[PDB]
């Protein structure tokens, strides 16, 4: 049955577009071109962003191109500028084609490419909140502020499995667990789109699930190099968030640029047409990632010509090509259709999907609109939500002697290269693609230094970085200036405590590839030199990947992992360090300790017959929580039962906080060697000092199924254990079920 209901009025409109459209118009609707192609750059340098009328005439008038993407001039623009540009684009599209353009933008964590928007912590941070509602509210705000520039389509959310800490895109998704990505991805989709996928309202956008699928586990750790994914992992884990999002009505999917089992995913008919469109009966849009049809020819050599690559990818089930420079795509596809290599059935289906999306977004009736009414843009109300997200994502990993919180009045030596910059805090997909320009445009927001000054007074903060990042040149995200560790060491005698901010500078995608996961040698020497002053040290980790720090964690009294908390991350940190907020974040991935002992939390028991830095689900706070009375309604169950778990959680310390309650399962014996432990549900609860609450968490029996060797889901007769916080119970499945459908439920 269709995952998104059929709107007959939309289908009727589509049928009558398809009867009347020229082949050139149809092909144009399957083509997407990046904004640079239609930009007048010399006039833009002098007078601000300006489109080229002549190039619009070519792209839209002659070739009938149905979609544009990307940020004008490679840098975030004012919403007024966005709106003026999209207006001109739509006036042209309605005049020459009669079909409105769909403009896609990478608004990744709030409005990446719209100035003065509300910027949220990155995906990995949102995972660490274990707060679905907060993720939803973040996406709702991003949608609102995206539509404030007349943009209807966001290339988000990202639901790759961040299971490889070498990978430059580990931070874009919600971490290493497939359940966390599925649930948060669904929360983002609901926020972005609203509750009716057929009528995306004024303040909502179409979501795009990225990057279908298995993108996050390249064998070498290098971006867009081959993964080697097992049959069971592909169905059970990598597919899981896409399955969940599509069933909630996500309107579009972007395909994985990379390769597995010798096949680029853009050429994988089975995964695109069968697993996605046909098995789920899903009428949404599949779009390529950047240049990926041409990559079949030039990068991977599975096509002799670009034209042969078009044939392969379109026949594999792609609907729209992110070319993104060459209107010649249209010529090639037309030739293929005339030759009989690509059928009209396939062209008509692609165009149906493009038009359907456009109708769902109301673009025929409202191709652009007045933006005056979007008066909550950049508001205090929206910022308080981003601040909450940031507070809830920053993880307390170590606190010996309860050195935190730090009392107002103590003198703080602030050190390290991540201590005074918004570029660090944001990472990539922030004002520019690499994030390199963040400090030019993020002056209204607080760096770590600025926030600590507001909390403790400028007079109580001594800032001597010792090590700083070099100025931007050719994606030198790794490069630091010569260390001057001599300086903060000398200044230490005047401080009570040292906070050292370390990790990475901003990068995005392939330029962010690393050759050594170990934290920078200069950064490690800075921490060692400071340790030897005898003053206590608090490490602040600000990075897109968990850099190896096994030699410096023993020298630190406390450690806070902020990951990429973005524009309110400095404020959040200061609020947490002073106890005005209480820590609640938990690790959404496994932090490795040794460079050739990398592992995820759901390892097979042969892997621990297990030496890591901090595990998945770990996080401290300024209070403690007791779990008791773990019960279930049906201790003996089958696939079709609803299991209802309850547990009492009591705040036994002296201050209020939020506890993320995680529910894990363990299959003791199975026909495939079972994951040692698996997250199955979670729920976050607020508790005052001394307060108990009964937390309810529900599962279907079939949630304890796994994908067997033969590719089929099975729930087997036998024993399981359930772990919730500190507490364990026994349950029994009383009968085996094997599914003949590709998916459960
Ligand atoms: O910018 C459009 C697309 O281009 C590619 O570089 C990235 O992999 C995608 O995440 C992005 O949505
Ligand atoms: Mg079993």
Author numbering: 26 to 634, 647 to 782
What is the paper's account of this structure, in its own sentences?
Like GH43, there are two GH3 members (BoGH3A and BoGH3B) present in the Bo XyGUL, both of which have been shown to be β-glucosidases with very similar specific activities. BoGH3B comprises a three-domain architecture, consisting of an N-terminal (TIM) barrel-like domain (residues 26 to 419), a central α/β sandwich domain (residues 420 to 660) and a fibronectin type-III (FN-III)-like domain at the C-terminus (residues 661–782). The dimeric organization of this novel enzyme appears potentially important for function, with a large, flexible loop reaching over from one protomer to contact the substrate and fully assemble the active site of the neighbouring molecule. BoGH3B was found to co-purify with glucose in its active site. This could readily be modelled with a 4C1 chair conformation, highlighting the position of the −1 sub-site. Within the GH3B active site, putative catalytic nucleophile (Asp314) and acid/base (Glu534) residues can be observed in close proximity to the glucose moiety, poised for nucleophilic attack. Away from the −1 sub-site, the exterior surface structure of the GH3B active pocket deviates from the most closely related homologues, presenting as a more closed structure similar to that seen in the distantly related barley β-glucosidase. GH3B has significant activity for glucose-only oligosaccharides but displays far weaker activity on xyloglucan-derived oligos, which retain their xylose side chains. Similar to barley β-glucosidase, such observations might suggest that the narrowing of the active site cleft could be responsible for the high specificity of BoGH3B towards β-1,4-linked glucans.
In this context, we recently reported the characterization of a novel xyloglucan utilization locus (XyGUL) that confers Bacteroides ovatus, and species harbouring syntenic XyGULs, with the ability to utilize this abundant vegetable polysaccharide across sampled human populations. Here, we present the three-dimensional structures of BoGH31, BoGH43A, BoGH43B and BoGH3B, expanding our knowledge of the structural determinants required for xyloglucan degradation. Our analyses highlight key adaptations in these enzymes that confer their specificity for xyloglucan oligosaccharides, while also providing a rationale for the maintenance of two divergent genes coding for GH3 enzymes, and similarly two divergent genes for GH43 family members, within the same PUL. While we were unable to determine a structure for BoGH3A, our structural and sequence analysis of BoGH3B has also allowed us to highlight further potential differences between these two enzymes encoded by the operon. Together with existing biochemical data, our analyses of the three-dimensional structures, and various enzyme-inhibitor complexes, of BoGH31, BoGH43A, BoGH43B and BoGH3B provide molecular-level insight into the stepwise breakdown of xyloglucan by the BoXyGUL.
